[PDB]
Amino acid sequence: SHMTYPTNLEIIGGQGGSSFSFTGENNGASLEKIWVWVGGWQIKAVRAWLSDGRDETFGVPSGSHQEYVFTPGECFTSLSLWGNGAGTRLGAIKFKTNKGGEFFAHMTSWGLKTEYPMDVGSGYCLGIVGRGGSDIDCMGFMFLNAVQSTVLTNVNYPTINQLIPKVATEEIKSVSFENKTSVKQEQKVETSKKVIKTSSWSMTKSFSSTFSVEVSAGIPEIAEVSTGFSISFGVESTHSLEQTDEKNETLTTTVEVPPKKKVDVHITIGRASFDLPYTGTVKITCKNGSVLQYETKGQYKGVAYTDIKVNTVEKDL
């Protein structure tokens, strides 16, 4: 049998110190900044920040540090690690990024020996894992493996049943008919109106800049019933994380004009702006068949419309 994993991690160095694990495996967070302190025959310490705000130091800093700051969407293209030649510490880190950056931090006295080039997977670095004490005994960088799909699913809007939506009226057209005869009359009125419907689900920028996130979700919809407006949780379908859809809404109406009456026809549409929290599950499927999933929450913003409405008012003359 053959085992695959959604992350790629190759740890280099010795067996001393105490284990550490500092990664976004739980929530999709990525490595956002790293400080590296070197010594004569080791990497001395590493401080790392993840995109979710976590910040931890391993080993004991001495001297000044080298820094690398990753921008959202910046991924590794390559990584090599060296031990210290004696098999007892990490000795050097070298990487390059898809934004043209390079970084090289190495011990200062002892010469570098065997280079270990790594497969960065997708290039999205989830953090670092190794062992430290006084120094960095060993370390590796964890990557998400190449991705087949990244999907936001199991979406809920937990406040949707409490929400009272503000629905603004857009006038489309009004016209007046006059029936001076003693028999009812029929008038056809055709209406068209462009509507622009939008949906967006917020996501940490690092993740959404690196991966094309598809959304499997119902969205909020708006309708006008007898008792007023009603919000509903629509049927689940596929969306992009930010989605806009234009269409020409149309309607054909037959207006009845009673004898000796004026009828005014008022044709309108209601526009609603949703701004409410959502929860869901991010499901990553790797090319190698493995999966990584985690729960998330953010803000849904949406613009939705009612059906075109026709109201008629009758008057004399």
Ligand X SMILES: OC[C@H]1O[C@H](O[C@H]2[C@@H](O)[C@H](O)[C@@H](CO)O[C@@H]2O)[C@@H](O)[C@@H](O)[C@@H]1O
User: With b meaning 16 or more CB within 10 Å and e meaning fewer, what string describes 124-136?
Assistant: bbbbbbbbbeebb
CB of 143 to ligand X, least distance (A): 24
**CB neighbour class for 259 (10 Å; exposed up to 12, middle 13-18, buried from 19):** exposed
Is 245 part of any known ligand binding site?
no
Residues 139, 12: contact at Cβ < 8 Å? Answer: yes
**CB neighbour class for 102 (10 Å; exposed up to 12, middle 13-18, buried from 19):** exposed
Give the distance from CA 47 to its chain's centroid.
27
Q: Which tokens sit at 58?
A: 């391993």
Is 196 part of any known ligand binding site?
no
Under the binding rule (CB under 8 A), the answer on residue 189 touching a second copy is yes
CB of 13 to Cl ion, least distance (A): 7
Q: Which tokens sit at 40?
A: 């004569």
Using CA atoms, how far apart are residues 218 and 202, in angstroms rounded to an integer? 15
Under the binding rule (CB under 8 A), the answer on residue 29 touching a second copy is no
- The terminus-to-terminus CA distance of the chain in angstroms comes to 88
Under the binding rule (CB under 6 A), the answer on residue 137 touching ligand X is yes
Q: Which tokens sit at 66?
A: 């080298």
Under the binding rule (CB under 8 A), the answer on residue 211 touching a second copy is yes
Among all residues, whose Cβ is closest to ligand X? 133
Q: What is the DSSP string of 14-41?
A: -S-SEEEEEE-TTT---EEEEEEEE-SS
Under the binding rule (CB under 6 A), the answer on residue 85 touching ligand X is no
Under the binding rule (CB under 8 A), the answer on residue 288 touching a second copy is yes
Among 66, 88, 134, 149, binds a second copy (CB under 8 A): 149
Is 222 part of any known ligand binding site?
no
Is 137 part of any known ligand binding site?
yes
Among 40, 87, 259, 289, binds Cl ion (CB under 5 A): 87
Under the binding rule (CB under 6 A), the answer on residue 134 touching ligand X is yes
Residues between 4 and 63 with contacts to ligand X, criterion CB under 6 A: 16-17
Under the binding rule (CB under 6 A), the answer on residue 87 touching ligand X is no
Give 83 or 280: the residue with its C-beta nearer to Cl ion: 83
* Binding positions: 17, 134-137
Point out which residues bind a second copy (CB under 8 A): 76-78, 96, 98, 100, 117-123, 145-150, 170-177, 189-192, 194-196, 209-212, 240, 246-248, 250, 252, 286-288
Point out which residues bind Cl ion (CB under 5 A): 83, 85, 87
* Binding positions for a mannooligosaccharide derivative: 17, 134-137
